[PDB]
Design an enzyme around this catalytic site. Structure first.
Site, PDB file in Angstrom:
ATOM      1  N   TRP A 119     -19.605  15.787  62.926  1.00  0.00           N
ATOM      2  CA  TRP A 119     -18.660  14.773  63.204  1.00  0.00           C
ATOM      3  C   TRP A 119     -18.173  13.955  61.903  1.00  0.00           C
ATOM      4  O   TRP A 119     -18.950  13.884  60.821  1.00  0.00           O
ATOM      5  CB  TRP A 119     -19.410  13.760  64.140  1.00  0.00           C
ATOM      6  CG  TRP A 119     -18.365  12.891  64.824  1.00  0.00           C
ATOM      7  CD1 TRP A 119     -18.168  11.512  64.698  1.00  0.00           C
ATOM      8  CD2 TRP A 119     -17.446  13.388  65.698  1.00  0.00           C
ATOM      9  NE1 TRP A 119     -17.111  11.457  65.668  1.00  0.00           N
ATOM     10  CE2 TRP A 119     -16.681  12.191  66.161  1.00  0.00           C
ATOM     11  CE3 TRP A 119     -17.234  14.652  66.702  1.00  0.00           C
ATOM     12  CZ2 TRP A 119     -15.614  12.387  67.377  1.00  0.00           C
ATOM     13  CZ3 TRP A 119     -16.328  14.786  67.332  1.00  0.00           C
ATOM     14  CH2 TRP A 119     -15.678  13.739  67.988  1.00  0.00           C
ATOM     15  N   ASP A 175     -12.279   7.104  58.595  1.00  0.00           N
ATOM     16  CA  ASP A 175     -11.430   5.925  59.002  1.00  0.00           C
ATOM     17  C   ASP A 175     -11.642   5.790  60.570  1.00  0.00           C
ATOM     18  O   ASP A 175     -12.504   6.524  61.205  1.00  0.00           O
ATOM     19  CB  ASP A 175      -9.992   6.000  58.917  1.00  0.00           C
ATOM     20  CG  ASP A 175      -9.426   7.459  59.525  1.00  0.00           C
ATOM     21  OD1 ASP A 175     -10.028   8.480  59.400  1.00  0.00           O
ATOM     22  OD2 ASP A 175      -8.300   7.337  60.204  1.00  0.00           O
ATOM     23  N   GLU A 178     -11.069   8.687  62.708  1.00  0.00           N
ATOM     24  CA  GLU A 178     -12.026   9.624  62.419  1.00  0.00           C
ATOM     25  C   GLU A 178     -11.695  10.829  61.817  1.00  0.00           C
ATOM     26  O   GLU A 178     -12.272  11.974  61.970  1.00  0.00           O
ATOM     27  CB  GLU A 178     -12.991   9.950  63.899  1.00  0.00           C
ATOM     28  CG  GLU A 178     -13.512   8.687  64.674  1.00  0.00           C
ATOM     29  CD  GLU A 178     -14.088   9.266  66.018  1.00  0.00           C
ATOM     30  OE1 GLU A 178     -13.800   9.404  66.905  1.00  0.00           O
ATOM     31  OE2 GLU A 178     -15.355   9.238  65.671  1.00  0.00           O
ATOM     32  N   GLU A 179     -10.685  10.746  60.742  1.00  0.00           N
ATOM     33  CA  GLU A 179     -10.065  11.972  60.277  1.00  0.00           C
ATOM     34  C   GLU A 179     -10.082  12.096  58.611  1.00  0.00           C
ATOM     35  O   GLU A 179     -10.067  13.203  58.334  1.00  0.00           O
ATOM     36  CB  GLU A 179      -8.758  12.240  60.821  1.00  0.00           C
ATOM     37  CG  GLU A 179      -8.490  12.289  62.458  1.00  0.00           C
ATOM     38  CD  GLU A 179      -7.211  11.861  62.950  1.00  0.00           C
ATOM     39  OE1 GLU A 179      -6.260  11.198  62.161  1.00  0.00           O
ATOM     40  OE2 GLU A 179      -6.905  12.458  64.181  1.00  0.00           O
ATOM     41  N   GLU A 399      -5.408   7.148  77.093  1.00  0.00           N
ATOM     42  CA  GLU A 399      -5.307   6.814  75.677  1.00  0.00           C
ATOM     43  C   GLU A 399      -4.022   7.040  75.241  1.00  0.00           C
ATOM     44  O   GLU A 399      -3.343   6.361  74.567  1.00  0.00           O
ATOM     45  CB  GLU A 399      -6.212   7.838  75.037  1.00  0.00           C
ATOM     46  CG  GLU A 399      -6.292   7.969  73.540  1.00  0.00           C
ATOM     47  CD  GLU A 399      -7.174   9.116  72.951  1.00  0.00           C
ATOM     48  OE1 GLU A 399      -6.218  10.025  72.739  1.00  0.00           O
ATOM     49  OE2 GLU A 399      -8.181   8.965  72.393  1.00  0.00           O
TER      50      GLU A 399
END
Ligand SMILES: *[C@@H]1O[C@H](CO)[C@@H](O[C@@H]2O[C@H](CO)[C@@H](O[C@@H]3O[C@H](CO[C@H]4O[C@H](CO)[C@@H](O)[C@H](O[C@H]5O[C@H](CO)[C@@H](O)[C@H](O)[C@@H]5O)[C@@H]4O)[C@@H](O)[C@H](O[C@H]4O[C@H](CO)[C@@H](O)[C@H](O)[C@@H]4O[C@H]4O[C@H](CO)[C@@H](O)[C@H](O)[C@@H]4O[C@H]4O[C@H](CO)[C@@H](O)[C@H](O)[C@@H]4O)[C@@H]3O)[C@H](O)[C@H]2NC(C)=O)[C@H](O)[C@H]1NC(C)=O
Ligand SMILES: *[C@@H]1O[C@H](CO)[C@@H](O[C@@H]2O[C@H](CO)[C@@H](O[C@@H]3O[C@H](CO)[C@@H](O)[C@H](O[C@H]4O[C@H](CO)[C@@H](O)[C@H](O)[C@@H]4O[C@H]4O[C@H](CO)[C@@H](O)[C@H](O)[C@@H]4O)[C@@H]3O)[C@H](O)[C@H]2NC(C)=O)[C@H](O)[C@H]1NC(C)=O
Ligand SMILES: *[C@H]1O[C@H](CO)[C@@H](O)[C@H](O)[C@@H]1O
Ligand SMILES: *[C@H]1O[C@H](CO)[C@@H](O)[C@H](O)[C@@H]1O
Ligand SMILES: *[C@H]1O[C@H](CO)[C@@H](O)[C@H](O)[C@@H]1O
Ligand SMILES: *[C@H]1O[C@H](CO)[C@@H](O)[C@H](O)[C@@H]1O
Ligand SMILES: *[C@H]1O[C@H](CO)[C@@H](O)[C@H](O)[C@@H]1O
Ligand SMILES: *[C@H]1O[C@H](CO)[C@@H](O)[C@H](O)[C@@H]1O
Ligand SMILES: *[C@H]1O[C@H](CO)[C@@H](O)[C@H](O)[C@@H]1O
Ligand SMILES: *[C@H]1O[C@H](CO)[C@@H](O)[C@H](O)[C@@H]1O
Ligand SMILES: *[C@H]1O[C@H](CO)[C@@H](O)[C@H](O)[C@@H]1O
Ligand SMILES: *[C@H]1O[C@H](CO)[C@@H](O)[C@H](O)[C@@H]1O
Length: 470
Positions: A119, A175, A178-179, A399
Site C-alpha cells: 500500500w 498524499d 494515496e498515489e 464516492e
C-alpha cells in the site's frame, strides 16, 4: 426553496448513514470492531471495507462538533472511537510499531488487525487528523468537569500522535489520495494545525508539548513554499499540474472562524485561497461533459485533480462539496470582519462573478459588498445543487458521479461523502467549529530549517470510561 429543503433532509440521512458504517452496532458494517469507522460497506469492486486513520479522523471530528452543539446521543460513538484508537496505536504493522513509525499506517482491517499487503504507506496526515479529533473531545471533557478522562485517556493518546507529527513532518510519504510519494499541502497544513492545538491542549491538562512548540513554526515556514504565485501546489515530487482539491480540503479543514483572511495559513477568504479556488475549479470546466455549456460564473462538477484516471477521472461528491464549503467559510469571515478586500491576487476570482470588481476594501454596508456576497452565495449553492441533482433518490452518496451521465459509481455509501455533506451544510448555516488558535500561529519565521523534534511514546490502556452525562 428546493435546496434548503433537500439540505435539511439530507443532513438527517447523512448522520444516519454515518452511524451505519461504525462498529459494532452499525447496520451496514457487521464485522467491524467497536468504534471502527468503515470507509464504505463495499467489500468488492472496490473493496473499501477497511478503516483509514484519515477517514475516521475527519468523520469523528465532524461528530464531535455536532455533539458539542447538542447531538448528545453521539457520546457513546465518540468514546468507542477513542477506545479503539488506544488499541490501533499499539498494533504492529508494515509502517512499524507505536514508537517506530506504526502511527503512520494508512489503513487497518475492520477487526483491528494490520493490513499487511502492499500500500502507499505511510500517510503522515493520519496522526494529525486523529489528534485534532481527540483534542476536540478532550476540550469538551475539560469544560464539563471530566478532568481525569481528559488527562488520563485523551492527552496520552494525543501525545503519541503529536510525537509522530513533530518527528517526521519533514519526510516524504503518500498524499491523501494515496498515489503520490512526495510532500503534500493537505498534510503539511493539517500537521501544522495539530501541533498548535496540541500545545494548547497539553497546557490545559497541566502538561507540555515542547516538540509542538519548536516544530509548528517550522511547519508553517515550509507551507509557504506551496504557493506558486498563481495557485497552491498540491504536491512536490509530482509531474502533474498541481491543481488539486487537496488544496481546498486543506483550507476548509484548517479554517479558524476567529481568523482574518490570512495568506500564511491559507484561510478560506485569504487572497491566495480565493485565487487557488478559481484555478482548481476551472481545471474541470472543459474536461467533463457534465460541465458543457456552463459559464465561468456558474458552479461545475468538481473532481480531485484534472489528471485523474481513477475510474476514468470523474467528479467526486466530497470535492464538489469542498468547493462550496470554502465559499461558505469566506462569507462567514467577511461577515464577521465587516468588510471584504479585493487584491490583484484575488481579482480574477471576484471578476468572474461580479464583472465590476476592482481592487479596494469594501465595507459590509457598501453596494459592492452586497453584490459580491450575493454572487458568491449563489455560486457556492450552485455546487451543492450539483450534488443534490446526482444523489440517489433516497439520499445515498457514493464516492463519485459519472463525468458524462452523472450516475453514481465507485464505493457506495461513502462515509466521507456524508461527513462532507454535514460540514458544508453547517457552514452554509453559519455553524462553525471551535477555534484552533490560528491568531497566535500565523507568523512565519525569517528562515526555514529542515528539522524535527523527537517527542515521546507510551502505550495507553483504556480500562474504563467514567460515567459521563451529556
Ligand atoms: C438507498 O437505496 C439503495 C438501493 O437499495 C441502498 O443501497 C443498497 O444497500 C444494500 C444494503 O442495505 C446493498 O446490499 C449489499 O449488496 C452487496 C452486493 O453489491 C453489489 O451487487 C449489487 C447487486 O447486483 C449492486 O447493486 C451493488 O452496487 C452498488 O455497490 C457498488 C459497489 O460499491 C456501486 O459501485 C454501485 O453503484 C451500487 O451502489 C454491488 O455491485 C452484498 O455483497 C451485500 O451483502 C453483504 O451484506 C449483507 C447485509 O448487509 C449480508 O447479509 C451479506 O452476507 C454480505 O455481508 C458481507 O459484507 C458485509 C459488508 O457489506 C459485511 O458486514 C459482512 O460481514 C459480510 O462480509 C463478509 O464477506 C466479505 C466478502 O468480500 C468479506 O470481505 C468480509 O470480510 C466478510 O468475510 C449487501 O447485500 C446494496 O448493494 C445497495 N444497492 C445499491 C444500488 O447501492 C442504500 O443503502 C439506501 N441508502 C440510504 C441512505 O438509506
Ligand atoms: C524539509 O524542510 C525544508 C525546509 O523548509 C524543505 O526545503 C524547502 O523545499 C522547498 C521545495 O523544494 C524549496 O523551495 C524551492 O525553491 C526553489 C528556489 O530556491 C524553487 O525553484 C522551487 O520551485 C518549485 O516549487 C515552486 C513553488 O514554491 C513552483 O512554483 C516551481 O514550479 C517549482 O515546482 C516544481 O518543481 C518542484 C521541485 O522543487 C517539483 O517537485 C514540483 O512538483 C513542481 O513541478 C521551490 O520553490 C525551499 O527552498 C526549501 N527551503 C529551504 C530552506 O531549503 C524541504 O523540502 C522539506 N522536505 C520535506 C520532504 O518535507
Ligand atoms: C496569525 O498569527 C500571527 C501570530 O503568530 C499574527 O501576527 C497574525 O496577525 C495572525 O493572527
Ligand atoms: C511571528 O512569530 C513566529 C512564531 O514563533 C516567529 O518565529 C516569527 O519570526 C514572527 O515573530
Ligand atoms: C532540526 O534543526 C533545527 C535547526 O537547524 C534544530 O534546532 C533542531 O533541533 C533539529 O536538529
Ligand atoms: C527528527 O529528525 C531530525 C533530523 O532533522 C533529528 O535530528 C531529530 O533528533 C529527530 O529524530
Ligand atoms: C525520538 O528520539 C528520542 C530520543 O532518542 C526518543 O525518546 C523518542 O522515542 C523518539 O525516538
Ligand atoms: C517520553 O516521555 C513520556 C512522558 O514523560 C514517558 O512516559 C515516556 O516513557 C518517554 O520517556
Ligand atoms: C507511558 O504513558 C502511558 C500513559 O500514561 C502509560 O500507560 C504507560 O504505562 C507509560 O507510563
Ligand atoms: C499500547 O501498545 C501496546 C503494545 O506495545 C498495546 O498492548 C496496548 O494495547 C496499546 O495499544
Ligand atoms: C496500558 O496499560 C497496560 C497495563 O495496565 C499495558 O499492558 C498496556 O501496554 C498499556 O501500557
Ligand atoms: C486500568 O489501567 C489503565 C492503565 O494501566 C489506567 O489508566 C486505568 O485508570 C485503570 O487503572
Amino acid at each position: 426553496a428546493t435546496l434548503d429543503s433537500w439540505l435539511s433532509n439530507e443532513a438527517t440521512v447523512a448522520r444516519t448513514a454515518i452511524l451505519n458504517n461504525i462498529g459494532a452496532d452499525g447496520a451496514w458494517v457487521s464485522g467491524a470492531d467497536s468504534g471502527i469507522v468503515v470507509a464504505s460497506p463495499s467489500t468488492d469492486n472496490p473493496d473499501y471495507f477497511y478503516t483509514w486513520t484519515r477517514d475516521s479522523g475527519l468523520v469523528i471530528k465532524t461528530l464531535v462538533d455536532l455533539f458539542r452543539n447538542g447531538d448528545t446521543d453521539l457520546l457513546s460513538t465518540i468514546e468507542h472511537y477513542i477506545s479503539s484508537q488506544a488499541i490501533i496505536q499499539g498494533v504492529s504493522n508494515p509502517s512499524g510499531d507505536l514508537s517506530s513509525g506504526g502511527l503512520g499506517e494508512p489503513k487497518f482491517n475492520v477487526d483491528e488487525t494490520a493490513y499487511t499487503g502492499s500500500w502507499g504507506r505511510p500517510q503522515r496526515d493520519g496522526p494529525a487528523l486523529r489528534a485534532t479529533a481527540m483534542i476536540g473531545f478532550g476540550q469538551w471533557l475539560l469544560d464539563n468537569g471530566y478532568t481525569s478522562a481528559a488527562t488520563e485517556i485523551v492527552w496520552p493518546l494525543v501525545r503519541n500522535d503529536l510525537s509522530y507529527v513533530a518527528q517526521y513532518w519533514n519526510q516524504t510519504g503518500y498524499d491523501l489520495w494515496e498515489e503520490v510519494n512526495g510532500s503534500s499541502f493537505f498534510t503539511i497544513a493539517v500537521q501544522h494545525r495539530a501541533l498548535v492545538e496540541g500545545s494548547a491542549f497539553a497546557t490545559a491538562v497541566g502538561s507540555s508539548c515542547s516538540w509542538c512548540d519548536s516544530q509548528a513554526p517550522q511547519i508553517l515556514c515550509y507551507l509557504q513554499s506551496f504557493w506558486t504565485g498563481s495557485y497552491i501546489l498540491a504536491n512536490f515530487d509530482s509531474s502533474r499540474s498541481g491543481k488539486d482539491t487537496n488544496t481546498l480540503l486543506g483550507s476548509i479543514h484548517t479554517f479558524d472562524p476567529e481568523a482574518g483572511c490570512d495568506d500564511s495559513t491559507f484561510q478560506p477568504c485569504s487572497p491566495r485561497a480565493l485565487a487557488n479556488h478559481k484555478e482548481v475549479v476551472d481545471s474541470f470546466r472543459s474536461i467533463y461533459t457534465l460541465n458543457d455549456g456552463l459559464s465561468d460564473s456558474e458552479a461545475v462538477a468538481v473532481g480531485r485533480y484534472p489528471e485523474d484516471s481513477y475510474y476514468n477521472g470523474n467528479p467526486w461528491f466530497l470535492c464538489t462539496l469542498a468547493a462550496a464549503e470554502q465559499l461558505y467559510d469566506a462569507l462567514y469571515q467577511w461577515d464577521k470582519q465587516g468588510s471584504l478586500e479585493i487584491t490583484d491576487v484575488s481579482l480574477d476570482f471576484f471578476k468572474a462573478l461580479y464583472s465590476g470588481a476592482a481592487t479596494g476594501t469594501y465595507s459590509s454596508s457598501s453596494s459592492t459588498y452586497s453584490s459580491i456576497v450575493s454572487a458568491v452565495k449563489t455560486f457556492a449553492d450552485g455546487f451543492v445543487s450539483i450534488v443534490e441533482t446526482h444523489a440517489a433518490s433516497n439520499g445515498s452518496l457514493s464516492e463519485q458521479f459519472d463525468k458524462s451521465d452523472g450516475d453514481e459509481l465507485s464505493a457506495r455509501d461513502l462515509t466521507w461523502s456524508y461527513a462532507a455533506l454535514l460540514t458544508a451544510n453547517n457552514r452554509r448555516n453559519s455553524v462553525v467549529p471551535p477555534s484552533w488558535g490560528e491568531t497566535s500561529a500565523s507568523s512565519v519565521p525569517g528562515t526555514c530549517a529542515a528539522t524535527s523534534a523527537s517527542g515521546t511514546y507510551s502505550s495507553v490502556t483504556v480500562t474504563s470510561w467514567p460515567s459521563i452525562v451529556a
